[PDB]
A paper describes a structure:
[name] has 35 genes assorted in functional groups or modules, among them, a gene coding for an antirestriction protein called [name]. Interestingly, [name] contains an N-terminal [name] binding domain and a C-terminal metalloprotease domain. [name] is structurally similar to DNA-binding dependent metalloproteases involved in the maintenance of genetic stability such as Spartan or IrrE.
Using this preliminary structure, the apo [name] structure was solved at 2.0 Å resolution by molecular replacement (MR). Apo [name] crystallized in the H3 space group containing one molecule per asymmetric unit. Electron density was not observed for the N-terminal residues 1–6, the flexible small loop residues 33–39, residues 136–141 in the region connecting both domains and C-terminal residues 294–297. The N-terminal domain is composed of three α-helices (α1-α3), a three-stranded β-sheet (β1, β3, and β4) that supports a long and protuberant β-hairpin (β3-β4), a smaller two-stranded antiparallel β-sheet formed by β2 and β5, as well as three 310 helices labeled from η1 to η3. These proteins belong to the gluzinzin metalloprotease family characterized by the presence of the conserved residues HExxH located on the “active site helix” (α5 in [name]) and an additional conserved motif (E,H)xx(A,F,T,S,G) located in the contiguous α-helix or “glutamate helix” (α7 in [name]).
Numbering used by the authors: 7 to 32, 40 to 135, 142 to 293
């Protein structure tokens, strides 16, 4: 079937239900080798886990479960994850090789659906003051963070800095750092970094940047042990629905861009290099 439309339809339904897929955790989903899923697969597996009530982070193909001594239980239904790539094909008239880009599906099962797996496969309280570890992380991203009494958090792309209100006015360090995480996600879109604002001139006012930032903030908060704030997104949800109904590929681009934003903050903070 149409993988693009199948995923987009699942997302549209979760939004119309009142709980968008990427909000469901409120636990990164992992492959059988322990590596995290990425991009649109994170969103799909969060949704499935919530829909079906799974608690394990791990997802297996039937074969991967078999190789580990596990058996998918009778009657259990798998879940779709997608892979993009290129594959070698030939012209036909000529034999010229031409790598073709493709989208394909895989079926995976949560560890909770499987008997016999090794046992390995079966939030920090921050109070109201600054946290040394989270302060160190955000400093290491490279973001210029400025503070004033203005009671609004935002990323200023022209001066290229994040404005935060004072932490004491949140009466919750968790709320402070979740808010900073959200603005740091926007901060990755600057022309000198991921360059989202010029690449996605959003003429049909799909609120595409806010969708990327919300998904990217969920990914970043998942990895930081924080709880994202969703209350500042009611104004965009209708445009997101409109966008998804118009373009069955859009949520894939948004999830990929979201993943790139979360990647860049974590790479900067680890002094990642090639």
């Amino acid at each position: 079937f149409d993988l693009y439309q199948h995923v987009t339809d699942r997302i549209i339904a979760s939004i119309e239900a009142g709980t968008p897929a990427w909000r469901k955790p409120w636990q990164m989903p992992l492959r059988s080798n322990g590596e995290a899923y990425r991009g649109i697969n994170v969103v799909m597996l969060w949704l499935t886990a919530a829909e079906k009530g799974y608690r394990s982070a791990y997802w297996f193909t039937y074969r991967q479960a078999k190789e580990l001594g596990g058996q998918v239980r009778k009657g259990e239904k798998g879940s779709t994850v997608v892979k993009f790539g290129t594959i070698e094909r030939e012209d036909e008239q000529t034999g010229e090789e031409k790598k073709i880009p493709y989208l394909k599906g895989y079926t995976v099962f949560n560890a909770d659906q499987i008997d016999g797996l090794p046992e390995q496969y079966h939030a920090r309280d921050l109070g109201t003051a600054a946290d040394p570890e989270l302060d160190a992380f955000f400093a290491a991203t490279g973001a210029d963070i400025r503070t004033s009494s203005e009671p609004r958090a935002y990323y200023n792309p022209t001066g290229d800095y994040i404005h935060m209100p004072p932490i004491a006015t949140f009466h919750s360090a968790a709320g402070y750092y979740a808010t900073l995480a959200h603005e740091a996600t926007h901060w990755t879109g600057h022309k000198s970094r991921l360059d989202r604002f010029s690449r996605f001139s959003d003429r049909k006012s799909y609120a595409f940047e806010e969708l990327i930032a919300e998904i990217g903030n969920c990914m970043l908060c998942a990895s930081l042990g924080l709880i994202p704030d969703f209350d500042q997104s009611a104004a965009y949800v209708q445009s997101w629905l409109r966008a998804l109904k118009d373009d069955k590929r859009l949520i894939f681009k948004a999830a990929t861009e979201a993943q790139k934003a979360a990647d860049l903050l974590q790479e900067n903070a680890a002094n990642f290099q090639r």
